[PDB]
Amino acid sequence: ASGWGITGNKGRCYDFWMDFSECMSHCREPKDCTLLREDYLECLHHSKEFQRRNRIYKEEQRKL
Amino acid sequence: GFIMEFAENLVLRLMENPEERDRKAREHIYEMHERCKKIKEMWALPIRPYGFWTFERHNAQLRWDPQISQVAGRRDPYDDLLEDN
Asked: Do A26 and B54 touch (CB under 8 A)?
């Protein structure tokens, strides 16, 4: 969010956060582009990708 | 003269205009009710305004970061590579 990266280049999630903030800067209702907020949040933690890989491993496991 | 001929008009001067009193009463009622409606409307305002973040004082970063994205420690890796030419 701040934009100061650990390696000294940039926050990997800074561009997504700035896109979300720029959308919210001219959108009086948050529901119109909540997609960008979701993108920023799951860019921080990679929740959806990990869920998908968990589903893949479950499909592997059910073959037992 | 005598006492009563003067006390009469003295009391009459002491008393006020009733037409002025009635006009002031109906007026005061009118503006008091209008102001009552105004205050009732004012109490309906939510604590958080509809715009909020839309306000220019509540951004403070969309016009600060662009003049900072050139300093060292915030640049996209593909900025110093092709800046030489």
From this structure: yes
Specify the experimental method.
Answer: cryo-EM
State residue B37 phi and psi, 5-degree precision: -65, -40
If 0-12 CB within 10 Å is exposed, 13-18 middle and 19+ buried, where does residue B33 land? exposed
> What 3 state SS string does chain A have?
CCCCCCCCCCCCCHHHHHHHHHHHCCCCCCCCCHHHHHHHHHHHHCHHHHHHHHHHHHHHHCCC
**Nearest Cα to Cα of residue B73 among A18, A12, A10:** A10
Contact across the interface for A3 and B72, Cβ inside 8 Å: no
Q: How many CB atoms lie within 10 A of CB A15?
A: 14
The resolution in Å comes to 3.7
- Tell me whether residues A26 and B51 touch, CB distance under 8 A: no
Distance, CA of A46 to CA of A34 (rounded, Å): 17
Q: What does the block give as tokens for A56?
A: 């893949």
| CB-based contact, B61 to chain A, within 8 Å | yes
